DNA sequence: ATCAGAATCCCGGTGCCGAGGCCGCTCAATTGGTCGTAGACAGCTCTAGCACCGCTTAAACGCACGTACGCGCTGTCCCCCGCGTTTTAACCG
DNA sequence: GATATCGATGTATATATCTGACACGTGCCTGGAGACTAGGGAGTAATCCCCTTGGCGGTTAAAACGCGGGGGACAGCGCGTACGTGCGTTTAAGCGGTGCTAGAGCTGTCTACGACCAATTGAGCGGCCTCGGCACCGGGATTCTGAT
């Protein structure tokens, strides 16, 4: 799966932002691996439009 | 503010350390003499102790943030860390 | 086997020893030795996850010891600790 | 002093700019930094006890992930 | 009659209690042992601060009975016990009987 | 005003407001639903209502207590899944 | 009927208790997913409760191994057994 | 909606120091016999497991009137963002 | 309109009474104390070595102050609205119990099996030779956004 997602973000070997992706893709995996996470984490975009100043 | 998300997306991408040598480590050497006098620390465990404070300050204040949405637009408070710690139960 | 054991006894007895004429009820009864029954396990794998770490395939005081240090906060069970030398000490001397 | 300042206040700005937090305070960087000792006297504390047992007085990559797993989260460190 | 280790060490804990896992439970080859008076003390002590701080907590509300949620309200009067037990919560907990300024009127 | 007498009273009271039987007789369908044929105790039923009962009025404090912060009393579902996030176990 | 009991499940219990817990008025896209998510949790620890009993060749599901699941997930609760 | 600006996303060149990999060895992995020992299946004691019943009604559900507040607009000031410049120190070696 | 009776019917005012729940003892049961024999494991310390702190220089991006500045928590008001509170309906929850029966838990029996012991041998990592993408500095494509 981190292959897979690797290949998706357009690079030849792994890393552990990879790594990253491929636990938070899966719903499952962030149900049960949910408890550890790995340098430099991340997650999808689940930004809001709040942030931006209105007008 | 809005450019501010911009960097957020930036330092999101960002997969790399920030303040390794010179700094951190002097911080865990004083805490480590306050505990027991004369404590090392390895270099490749001294790694894995910044990223993973960053890691959860990361995720700590993301919940923060999104606790100071509902206090309206944008603006963080000392309350919120406050509450927000109390609420899972680190307080 | 059959009989069924129960741990809340033990507290019973120093409660009566202190104070006999007050006590507890049934749904605390059962929380106090789910609780007892709890940290008896706790304890329990906390010797065991020092024993594998360690490579340490005995466990005689020191093991135990620093179990009673890393589950309890450290001047709580650096005292224990003081008393439970000194009473183990005492016990081997005299026999 | 400087036990303070280990941490500056663009470094919490920085983990802000990658932790969400758009709008900052003062006191927001000082409690963030006393969580930050509480955390870190924890774990450097638990690796004191553990390499007290064996009597050792150093800790290794995999005393740090002992001592990590004790807290719950637990974490995967390098090497082992 | 039969000697046992109770009146000779002086604690009403069971001693040997442990000794059934370690005999039983076949753990390893060498366990225990001089692990069970070590643990009774232990607990006997935690019980003995835990009984003191529900008594405590009991007597603030002018009655002499038990209760759960009584409990409830010494741990949660404790920040060190809660971060013990941060991930739990004890049934009946409700709210405490101090009313905030948020919900009493002008 | 009533408001008043009803906290005074409920924090007089403790009665367990879910009923065992309606939770029993969910558990028993759930139960057989998944796996058919299994039996189910009474005190485990009792238990696991009194942990979904703990565990909603713990959501609810932390509910309440997010939104008097936003000067608020009613709430929205935005802050139930706030307090599931930064439990995590969404 | 003894199927089918997802709205069996009340809400007004739920706001009576939060209504005890202070709460004065909630709303109605709150239960929508309120009780989404609670079926869901209910059937995660239904589920890892009859798993946990399943070991000792029982058919029964036994009061400790409902703590001790529930303590596994972390969101353990105190009772009779256990 | 639409054009210009700052930051960002991917790529190129270089330092290197930790990664990619060869060889021994030695402490562990495997195979083979014993057999008392401890797990799997038929049976004793009996407890509570699945489902429903006599009777009363508390409470869930559906519905009526209206108020505290949900959500949005307006005033403020103070209190932190944007940017230029200096030092200063983090990572390099 | 007044003075002096009759009663009467909530309103306490206790007074037994009997019932759910807590607190003590009781028959008995099953597992630890004593104890000897026999196997191993960490306390203590020496020794190779390595590796992480301290430190010198550098040098260019980041910390931090000065100045400009604008925007948003708080407070209050206003349109709406949705449950707050209560009334009508219904329906099984609960107290207490039963019909049928399954297995909780244990007990007995039975039969595959892993510590122990010994010979054979090989996989992972230390040591060490060789090398290539992380990190930094710089440029082209992508994304978001200010101002209009």
Same mark, same amino acid.
């Given at each position: 799966?981190?292959?897979?997602?690797?290949?998706?973000?357009?690079?030849?070997?792994? *890393?552990?932002?990879?790594?990253?992706?491929?636990?938070?893709?899966?719903?499952?995996?962030?149900?049960?691996?949910?408890?550890?996470?790995?340098?430099?984490?991340?997650?999808?975009?689940?930004?809001?439009?709040?942030?931006?100043?209105?007008? | 503010?809005?450019?501010?998300? $911009?960097?957020?997306?930036?330092?999101?991408?960002?997969?790399?350390?920030? *303040?390794?040598?010179?700094?951190?480590?002097?911080?865990?050497?004083?805490?480590?003499?306050?505990?027991?006098?004369?404590?090392?620390?390895?270099? /490749?465990?001294?790694?894995?102790?910044?990223?993973?404070?960053?890691?959860?300050?990361?995720?700590?204040?993301?919940?923060?943030?999104?606790?100071?949405?509902?206090?309206?637009?944008?603006?963080?408070?000392?309350?919120?860390?406050?509450?927000?710690? +109390?609420?899972?139960?680190?307080? | 086997?059959?009989?069924?054991?129960?741990?809340?006894?033990?507290?019973?007895?120093?409660?009566?020893?202190?104070?006999?004429?007050?006590?507890? /009820?049934?749904?605390?009864?059962?929380?106090?030795?789910?609780?007892?029954?709890?940290?008896?396990?706790?304890?329990?794998?906390?010797?065991?996850?020092?024993?594998?770490?360690?490579?340490? /395939?005995?466990?005689?005081?020191?093991?135990?010891? #620093?179990?009673?240090?890393?589950?309890?906060?450290?001047?709580?069970?650096?005292?224990?600790?003081?008393?439970?030398?000194?009473?183990?000490?005492?016990?081997? /001397?005299?026999? | 002093?400087?036990?303070?300042?280990?941490?500056?206040?663009?470094?919490?700005?920085?983990?802000? +700019?990658?932790?969400?937090?758009?709008?900052?305070?003062?006191?927001?960087?000082?409690?963030?930094?006393?969580?930050?000792?509480?955390?870190?006297?924890?774990?450097?504390?638990?690796?004191? #006890?553990? #390499?007290?047992?064996?009597?050792?007085?150093?800790?290794?990559?995999?005393?740090?992930?002992?001592?990590?797993? +004790?807290?719950?989260?637990?974490?995967?460190?390098?090497?082992? | 009659?039969?000697?046992?280790?109770?009146?000779?060490?002086?604690?009403?804990?069971?001693?040997? $209690?442990?000794?059934?896992?370690?005999?039983?439970?076949?753990?390893?080859?060498?366990?225990?042992?001089?692990?069970?008076?070590?643990?009774?003390?232990?607990?006997?002590?935690?019980?003995?601060?835990?009984?003191?701080?529900?008594?405590?907590?009991?007597?603030?509300?002018?009655?002499? +009975?038990?209760?759960?949620?009584?409990?409830?309200?010494?741990?949660?009067?404790?920040?060190?016990?809660?971060?013990?037990?941060?991930?739990?919560?004890?049934?009946?907990?409700?709210?405490?009987?101090?009313?905030?300024?948020?919900?009493?009127?002008?």
């Amino acid at each position: 799966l981190a292959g897979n997602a690797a290949r998706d973000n357009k690079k030849t070997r792994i *890393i552990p932002r990879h790594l990253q992706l491929a636990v938070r893709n899966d719903e499952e995996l962030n149900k049960l691996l949910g408890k550890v996470t790995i340098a430099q984490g991340g997650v999808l975009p689940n930004i809001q439009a709040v942030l931006l100043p209105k007008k | 503010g809005t450019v501010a998300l $911009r960097e957020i997306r930036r330092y999101q991408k960002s997969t790399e350390l920030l *303040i390794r040598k010179l700094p951190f480590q002097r911080l865990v050497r004083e805490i480590a003499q306050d505990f027991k006098t004369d404590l090392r620390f390895q270099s /490749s465990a001294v790694m894995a102790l910044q990223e993973a404070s960053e890691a959860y300050l990361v995720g700590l204040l993301e919940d923060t943030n999104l606790c100071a949405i509902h206090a309206k637009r944008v603006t963080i408070m000392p309350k919120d860390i406050q509450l927000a710690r +109390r609420i899972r139960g680190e307080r | 086997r059959s009989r069924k054991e129960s741990y809340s006894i033990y507290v019973y007895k120093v409660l009566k020893q202190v104070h006999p004429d007050t006590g507890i /009820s049934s749904k605390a009864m059962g929380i106090m030795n789910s609780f007892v029954n709890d940290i008896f396990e706790r304890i329990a794998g906390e010797a065991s996850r020092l024993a594998h770490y360690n490579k340490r /395939s005995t466990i005689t005081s020191r093991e135990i010891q #620093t179990a009673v240090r890393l589950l309890l906060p450290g001047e709580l069970a650096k005292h224990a600790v003081s008393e439970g030398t000194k009473a183990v000490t005492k016990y081997t /001397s005299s026999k | 002093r400087d036990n303070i300042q280990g941490i500056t206040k663009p470094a919490i700005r920085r983990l802000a +700019r990658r932790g969400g937090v758009k709008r900052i305070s003062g006191l927001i960087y000082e409690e963030t930094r006393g969580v930050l000792k509480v955390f870190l006297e924890n774990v450097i504390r638990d690796a004191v #006890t553990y #390499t007290e047992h064996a009597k050792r007085k150093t800790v290794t990559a995999m005393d740090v992930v002992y001592a990590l797993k +004790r807290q719950g989260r637990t974490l995967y460190g390098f090497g082992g | 009659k039969a000697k046992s280790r109770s009146s000779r060490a002086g604690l009403q804990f069971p001693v040997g $209690r442990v000794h059934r896992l370690l005999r039983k439970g076949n753990y390893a080859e060498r366990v225990g042992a001089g692990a069970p008076v070590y643990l009774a003390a232990v607990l006997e002590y935690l019980t003995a601060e835990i009984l003191e701080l529900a008594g405590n907590a009991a007597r603030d509300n002018k009655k002499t +009975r038990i209760i759960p949620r009584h409990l409830q309200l010494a741990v949660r009067n404790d920040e060190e016990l809660n971060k013990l037990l941060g991930k739990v919560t004890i049934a009946q907990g409700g709210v405490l009987p101090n009313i905030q300024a948020v919900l009493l009127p002008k």
